[PDB]
Amino acid sequence: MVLESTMVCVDNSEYMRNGDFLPTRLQAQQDAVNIVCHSKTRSNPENNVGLITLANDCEVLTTLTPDTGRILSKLHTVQPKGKITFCTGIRVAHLALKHRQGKNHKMRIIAFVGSPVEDNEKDLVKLAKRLKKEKVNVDIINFGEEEVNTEKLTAFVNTLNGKDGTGSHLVTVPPGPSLADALISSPILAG
Amino acid sequence: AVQKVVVHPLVLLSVVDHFNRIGKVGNQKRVVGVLLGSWQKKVLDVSNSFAVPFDEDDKDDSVWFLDHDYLENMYGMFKKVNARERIVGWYHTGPKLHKNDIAINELMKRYCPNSVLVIIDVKPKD
Amino acid sequence: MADPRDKALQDYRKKLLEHKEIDGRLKELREQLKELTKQYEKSENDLKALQSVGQIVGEVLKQLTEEKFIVKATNGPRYVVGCRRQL
Amino acid sequence: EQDGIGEEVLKMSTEEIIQRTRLLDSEIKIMKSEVLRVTHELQAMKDKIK
Amino acid sequence: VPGFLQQSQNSGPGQPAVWHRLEELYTKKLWHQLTLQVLDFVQDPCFAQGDGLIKLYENFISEFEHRVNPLSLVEIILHVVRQMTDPNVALTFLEKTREKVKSSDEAVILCKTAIGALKLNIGDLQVTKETIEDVEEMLNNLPGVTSVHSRFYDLSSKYYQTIGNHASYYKDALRFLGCVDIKDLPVSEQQERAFTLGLAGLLGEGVFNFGELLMHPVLESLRNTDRQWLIDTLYAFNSGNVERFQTLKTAWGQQPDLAANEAQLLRKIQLLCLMEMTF
């Protein structure tokens, strides 16, 4: 019933082409896209969801549309062959959120991290204080093989919303047999 | 290998107005739009065009937006009112081209393979 | 009762009966999407086929100049005409 | 293929728990994401060419 | 299957820290840090005598593969088929590895060069031209690999040891010089490239020197110490003087493949002095 615009941010790098998440990590992260799009549609039939990729390019393959079946057609041939790029992936995610055709919706980004990040901590904390001035809740969800709980991601969660902020949760995964049940326990309803 | 392009004199004109539409708030100093055309021979022809919502930031100079969704449906309308017309490329203004133009061109070559961009000069006319 | 060679073997049957059940409707539904594209091809050919404003059939009587000719309709009057560009 | 059936006879979990694993991974995907994408192609085309 | 590498643990130096690390990474069922490290440990400088002790497991990797980059799969099987050192079955082995990755992945193009690299060794005329010609038919629609330009222009570099290849090799040894750019391989290979590049452009018919590749640093920055006479004589063609001293001092030094065409060298300078004195 609440009005927002959720922007999912998948990874199609090479590092999702391994099988600790048992069938395929693409098959893991696509089901994660399956449950967040059906969550944001059934909790509110008025919002809209678009996807953005981050590896090797930043493609806006679906624009921020209310129908989810376009997204699910574009999750096929996602071609996991890229190399992770992070610093432009959120600035290209936010300028999409300044293209809101309905300017009463809130601004929300979710992102899937299945590759190690290689970026300065000073760049992201400038982006963190940018999003503080820009009032965006980004929910970082960790997948894949992981430099587990970096200080850069953890402080970016803290410097997203400090001094009694929202609490945009840093979702951590145990690498092993799991569904999106840890993804839906706390953060998909209380973020 | 394209021989040459032919400027129908409605398209330029229809870049001047849309630069004047946003020109009350114009500080981006660039307007990207889609160049409709008629592929005849090795020589090329241009008949019509339209615009697209476009943003760009010099900070990190790779953060920008064509709208694929707006490019699908509005071109689909111009296809419906005129089956002769199709896409041949795109355009922008602000006579110094910018570093992003590799990214726009290599994106929308998946609409027409031998796509072509045309820079007009709205303010220089001398 | 953990694994006495049959709770093993009864599983492999009910897992593989379920996979071939769900792979079957996938092939049937993909075949139906292949069929409608053939129908959509004929519709877009018809949308292309909607601008044959005709052509007038005549015969050349004589040549006036390099780009002026004298033609006549099959039941109508005579005219002075030209060519397109590169005829 | 005698070893193909026969290794499912003397192994109790390797030839079964993985088959439990690779089905429940498939059935939550190859059922779900595949036929729902195909569902969101047919409803569009009937809202098309009609 | 883990004990397959427990018995072939040896001869890879620092055995416990790397081979027990190896049997960690595929028991995590990951396929990139696994893949990048086995490519590193074949690149590990030894004799690589355990190619047979790894080509069974790399075939085992290839059997339940279903995710791994076929580029790096062929990039590691070329080291395997190198260390086989038996060209009888190595042709049919590489055809088998080429036909089992038969998708649209563009490592098949450098399978064909690896076919030809062992085919410009034996049977050097009848179908070597075809396995050359098929590659630039396929060198299309994605010029951004540049390893497609690497392996094929190396295949035509081995085609230089035919009779009628002087200018086309010189045209193509520049193409390899322009596709791959940075130093990234020793001067002890680079100055030998520029030495045979200057000889191919000198014995070529239509070319005389075609300067400002003289300005290109892969010949002058690498042999400004030894064989300066080749840089000196290519300046003398660009100078347009006859200058009988240094244009014979190249023939005093370079005795093979230069005294057999010294009259053509005198033929070239007499037609080259005109087009600079009229300039």
In whole angstroms, how far apart are CA D6 and each of B10, C4, C14, D1, D16?
77, 15, 18, 8, 13
Flag if B55 and A65 touch (Cβ within 8 Å).
no
Given a contact cutoff of 8 angstroms between Cβ atoms, the answer to whether E204 and E174 are in contact is no
- What kind and span of H or E run contains A64? strand A62-65
Domain boundaries, chain E: 1-279
Q: Quick one: residue A173, left, alpha or beta (phi over 0 = left, psi -120 to 50 = alpha)? A: beta
Interface test with chain D among A72, A74, A183, by most D beta carbons within 10 Å: A72
Domain boundaries, chain A: 3-186
For the record, the structure tokens of A78 come out as 């996602």
For the record, the structure tokens of A24 come out as 């395929």
CB-based contacts of A13, cutoff 8 Å, min separation 6 = A54, A55, A56, A80, A81, A82, A83, A84, A114, A115
Q: Quick one: residue E216, left, alpha or beta (phi over 0 = left, psi -120 to 50 = alpha)? A: beta
For chain E, the farthest-separated pair of C-alpha atoms sits apart, in whole angstroms, at 78
The contacts found for A40-45 with CB under 8 angstroms, 24 or more apart, are: A40/A4, A40/A6, A41/A66, A41/A68, A43/A1, A44/A1, A44/A2, A44/A3, A44/A4
Chain gaps in chain D, named by the residue before each (C–N > 2.5 Å): none
Backbone angles phi, psi at E86, to 5 degrees: -145, 90
CB-based contacts of E106, cutoff 8 Å, min separation 6 = E71, E142, E145, E148
Given a contact cutoff of 8 angstroms between Cβ atoms, the answer to whether E38 and A29 are in contact is no
Given a contact cutoff of 8 angstroms between Cβ atoms, the answer to whether A72 and A31 are in contact is no
In whole angstroms, how far apart are CA B64 and each of A90, B70, E177, E182?
12, 15, 36, 32
- What's the gap in Å between the CA of B10 and the closest CA on chain C? 23
Encoded amino acid at D39, one letter: T
Backbone angles phi, psi at E119, to 5 degrees: -110, -20
- 3-state SS class at C19: helix
Place of tokens 């047979």: E52
- In angstroms, the CA A147 to CA A84 distance is 14
Q: Where are the alpha helices (DSSP H) in C1-87?
A: 9-48
Q: Which is nearest to E153 in space by CA: E185, E124, E120, E176? A: E176
Q: Which is nearest to B115 in space by CA: B86, B95, B94? A: B86
HEC profile for E12-26?
Answer: CCCHHHHHHHHHHHC
Q: Where are the alpha helices (DSSP H) in chain A?
A: 25-43, 69-74, 87-97, 121-134, 151-158, 181-185
- In angstroms, the CA A157 to CA A67 distance is 30
Report strand pairing: B86-92 vs B116-119: parallel
Interface test with chain D among C20, C25, C29, C32, by most D beta carbons within 10 Å: C29
Backbone angles phi, psi at A139, to 5 degrees: -105, 105
For the record, the structure tokens of E260 come out as 């057999």
Report strand pairing: A106-113 vs A4-10: parallel
Q: Which is nearest to A139 in space by CA: A112, A120, A178, A179? A: A112
- In angstroms, the CA E70 to CA E98 distance is 10
- In angstroms, the CA A35 to CA A41 distance is 10
- In angstroms, the CA A104 to CA A107 distance is 10
- 3-state SS class at A74: helix
For the record, the structure tokens of B66 come out as 């064509």
Q: Is B102 on the interface with A (CB under 8 A)?
A: no
Q: Count CB atoms within 10 A of the CB of residue E213.
A: 19
- In angstroms, the CA E2 to CA D36 distance is 41
- In angstroms, the CA B24 to CA A123 distance is 34
- What kind and span of H or E run contains A113? strand A106-113
- In A, residues 57-76, which contact B (CB 8 Å cutoff)? 58, 60-63, 65
Q: Is B84 on the interface with C (CB under 8 A)?
A: yes
Q: Count CB atoms within 10 A of the CB of residue E62.
A: 17
**Buried (b) or exposed (e) across B43-77, using 16+ Cβ within 10 A?**
ebebbbbbbbebebeeeeebbbbbbbebbeeebee
Q: Which is nearest to E235 in space by CA: E217, E216, E252, E214? A: E214
- In A, residues 60-119, which contact E (CB 8 Å cutoff)? 81
Given a contact cutoff of 8 angstroms between Cβ atoms, the answer to whether A110 and A6 are in contact is yes
Q: Is B83 on the interface with C (CB under 8 A)?
A: yes
Given a contact cutoff of 8 angstroms between Cβ atoms, the answer to whether A32 and A143 are in contact is yes
Deposited experimental method: cryo-EM
